[PDB]
């Protein structure tokens, strides 16, 4: 099995990423990252596969003014694969889930990173292309 190796962190707090599911949300505003113990003055940051707490700044009214967990599926900051290749996506994206990692939506638009798929089987099930 094994755990995922560290990745370059490209999404600090206040980052606004696209919503990759069909829940009705259009973007996700990151307010915190789970698992961060932190350092003085250091902004919490997330990478592909990290669970974050976010708010919907643009979308259906039912999803706004609320704090919900989400998972990052794409990022623009390049990160190093163990095979020495640096990868990056064209945009930053995430999907809204519940505290147990189950997708709130039912479909995912666009590809998702392989790192996120391994950690979240529910997200991988609804994914189209896993790269």
């Amino acid at each position: 099995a094994g755990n995922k190796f560290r990745m370059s962190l490209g999404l600090p707090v206040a980052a606004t990423v696209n919503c990759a599911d069909n829940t009705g949300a259009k973007n996700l505003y990151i307010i915190s990252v789970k698992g961060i113990k932190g350092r003085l003055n250091r902004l919490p940051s997330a990478c592909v596969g990290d669970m974050v707490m976010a708010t919907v700044k643009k979308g259906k009214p039912d999803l706004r003014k609320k704090v919900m967990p989400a998972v990052i599926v794409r990022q623009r900051k390049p990160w190093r694969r163990k095979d020495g290749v640096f990868m990056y996506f064209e945009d930053n994206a995430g999907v809204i889930v519940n505290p147990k990692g189950e997708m709130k939506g039912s479909a995912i638009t666009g590809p998702i990173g392989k790192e996120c798929a391994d950690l979240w089987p529910r997200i991988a099930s609804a994914a189209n292309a896993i790269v």
Binding site: G2, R39, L40, K82, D83, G84
Partner: protein
């Protein structure tokens, strides 16, 4: 009053003072514990940092995400031509620590080592060890030399050999003055150590006799020099706001009112780099023996005929032609800097230490740019022989 918020201090107080090292060659502060039941063997070796490259290997780590997968990891090339034993020194255990009892030298010393004893070799008369070498030419003198060796066998508790590098064989270094150091002999009784040392007088000891493949070693040397440096770069203190009068690359408060003195724990600007360092647990991925396929960059999977040296040569170093070691990770010091290799002082039992390395690919593209050709022939064939 107490500081508003808590964060760890910047820098380590265990590496003070941050001064220029009083030596250029890495000094062995501690040798491996001696086990008499083992055969006599050297514990250290000198090498020269040639450069870095990356390799690809298939990992065998059960329970790991990388199990049966390929990983790319940086390696450092250390050219390690055989060393020449030129003397032996014995120490006696005293209530005031180890004291040097006597030093016995070989009859013949090379010009390269003799240069180490002069500040201007060419202008001197080159009288070093001339009178000493004569007593090897008389029966009474030979008896005296043997008597000194017997004296070491009787009183010495620690035996070290005097060994120097053959720096002439690496023309890239542009240096003729060889490096000399004491290498401790571990294993066997004191008599065996003296016999072991005396038997190697004027002979060569290859790096393979000290180290081998897949073992953990310690690398000792002096870091790259960087001169006078400010606190932000030297100690890692955060920068001050943009609108700070008189500059922002500073420590704001260097101490409370009391004690009415600046403490030694406060970050201050000064010398950065050129510090003596001892780094542990560097795994040996490959040992290249001249005249053998191990010296080339061939692998069981990549059969391309090519040498370890990247096309165009190792930058600022040259072409590696002698024995070398491929060491995982990074090595202290600049290119061409002499480094000291030491056997691990700990008992290596972790799975990483016992992992069997199997290289798939060794990159030999040019490191003076975005190299895309592994061999000169490949480049020439690409451009229709150019």
């Amino acid at each position: 009053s107490h500081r508003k918020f808590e964060h760890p201090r910047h820098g380590s107080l265990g590496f003070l003072p941050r001064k220029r090292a009083a030596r250029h060659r890495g000094k062995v502060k501690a040798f491996p514990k001696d086990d008499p039941s083992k055969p006599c063997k050297l514990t250290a070796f000198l090498g020269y940092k040639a450069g870095m490259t990356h390799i690809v290997r298939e990992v065998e780590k059960p329970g790991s995400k990388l199990h049966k997968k390929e990983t790319c990891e940086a390696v450092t090339i250390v050219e390690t031509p055989p060393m020449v034993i030129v003397g032996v020194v014995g120490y006696v255990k005293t209530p005031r620590g180890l004291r040097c009892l006597n030093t016995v030298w070989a009859q013949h010393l090379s010009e390269d080592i003799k240069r180490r004893f002069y500040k201007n070799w060419c202008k001197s008369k080159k009288k070093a060890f001339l009178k000493y070498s004569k007593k090897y030419e008389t029966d009474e003198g030979k008896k005296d030399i043997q008597a000194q060796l017997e004296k070491l066998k009787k009183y010495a508790c620690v035996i070290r050999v005097l060994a120097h590098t053959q720096i002439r064989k690496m023309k890239g270094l542009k240096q003729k003055k060889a490096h000399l150091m004491e290498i401790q002999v571990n294993g066997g009784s004191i008599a065996q150590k003296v016999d072991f040392a005396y038997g190697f007088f004027e002979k060569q000891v290859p790096v393979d006799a000290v180290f081998q493949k897949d073992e953990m070693i310690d690398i000792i040397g002096v870091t790259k020099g960087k001169g006078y440096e400010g606190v932000v770069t030297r100690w890692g203190v955060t920068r001050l706001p943009r609108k700070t009068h008189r500059g922002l690359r500073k420590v704001a408060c260097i101490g409370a009112w009391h004690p009415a003195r600046v403490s030694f724990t406060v970050a201050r600007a000064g010398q950065n780099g050129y510090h003596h360092r001892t780094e542990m647990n560097k795994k040996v991925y490959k040992l290249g023996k001249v005249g053998q396929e191990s010296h080339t960059a061939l692998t069981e999977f990549d059969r391309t005929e090519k040498d370890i040296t990247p096309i165009g040569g190792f930058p600022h170093y040259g072409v590696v032609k002698e024995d070398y070691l491929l060491i995982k990770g990074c090595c202290v010091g600049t290119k061409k800097r002499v480094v000291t290799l030491r056997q691990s002082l700990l008992n290596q039992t972790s799975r990483v230490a016992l992992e069997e390395i199997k290289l798939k690919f060794i990159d030999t593209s040019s490191k003076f740019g975005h190299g895309r050709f592994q061999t000169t022939q490949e480049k020439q064939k690409f451009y229709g022989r150019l």
